[PDB]
């Protein structure tokens, strides 16, 4: 009647990728951890843009869109920063946001590639993952881009600009033994990388009593958060959602009594 004790084994750990395996866990818990990876890990991204002068070919809201999609280093202070709704101050302040500035003019004849490097942050911890560079616009001679931006904490449920991850690879039952997928012709199907079968055997024998366990994850970071801390923050955020749910549930049960 109680929760199982899950186990984690990390196979690969690189600045861009974490490959790990979670065993003795439910499919629902595993899938929802993946789901939180994608949508419920807080990150910092530009959400306020004010363009003083835009003589580039791209219109203002195009530039704003591209600026929002630019990743920003959010390793440490995203936990410290508050949401704009939570912050007491009106509009935005150093606690709820980070300010960026762009002042580029193409005085020279050669085309000026405005990059993420040209974005200058008021706080050193958030930088546009520059330490090539993301190209915001190309400026012909006599064309100028000037803008001020504010970056706020948020998660990917709001907007895909706040996705901390690129691709979450989730696989269970590498050799089809639970028959969750029924191949019409099993031999035509390529083997998984995690498959332990011999080359002759296309599918493992049907396990009637089996349950999905030993889930395999490959989480690729977008560079804003380290791939390890994406997973840690996802676990902590899911735990916090459950705890908030429990608090509200206890309050309503007390109210009913």
């Amino acid at each position: 009647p109680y929760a199982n004790q899950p186990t984690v084994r990390i196979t690969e750990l690189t600045d861009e990728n974490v490959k790990f395996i979670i065993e003795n866990t439910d499919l629902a818990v595993a899938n929802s951890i993946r789901r939180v990876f994608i949508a419920e890990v807080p990150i910092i991204a530009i959400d306020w843009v004010q363009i003083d002068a835009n003589s580039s070919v791209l219109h203002d809201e195009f530039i704003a869109h591209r600026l929002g999609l630019i990743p920003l280093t959010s390793d440490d202070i995203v936990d410290k920063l508050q949401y704009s709704r939570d912050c007491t101050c009106e509009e935005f302040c150093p606690e709820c946001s980070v300010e960026f500035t762009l002042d580029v003019r193409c005085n020279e004849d050669q085309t000026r590639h405005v990059t993420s490097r040209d974005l200058i942050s008021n706080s050193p911890r958030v930088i546009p993952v520059t330490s090539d560079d993301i190209l915001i616009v190309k400026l012909r001679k006599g064309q100028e881009l000037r803008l001020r931006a504010y970056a706020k904490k948020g998660f990917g449920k709001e907007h895909a600009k706040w996705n901390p991850t690129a691709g979450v690879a989730f696989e269970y039952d590498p050799d089809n033994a639970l028959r969750h997928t029924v191949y019409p012709k099993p031999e035509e199907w390529p083997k998984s990388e995690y498959s332990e079968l011999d080359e002759d055997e296309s599918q493992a024998p049907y396990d009637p009593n089996g349950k999905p366990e030993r889930f395999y994850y490959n989480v690729e970071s977008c560079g804003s958060l380290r791939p390890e801390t994406i997973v840690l923050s996802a676990l902590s955020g899911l735990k916090k959602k459950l705890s908030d749910l429990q608090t509200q549930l206890s309050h309503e049960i007390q109210s009913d009594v």
Binding site: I46, Q50, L67
Partner: protein
């Protein structure tokens, strides 16, 4: 207001009820020039 010229790209100030001709080029197509008030764009 101040209207930028279509061809020579030089700002010229034209009063109301005045013919639309840029000084020093004579082009008859002017552009109103961007507003001072600033509009907030959500990056979304």
């Amino acid at each position: 207001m101040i209207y930028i010229c279509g061809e020579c790209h030089t700002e010229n100030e034209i009063k109301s009820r005045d013919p639309i001709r840029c000084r020093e080029c004579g082009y008859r197509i002017m552009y109103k020039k961007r507003t001072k008030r600033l509009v907030v764009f959500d990056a979304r």
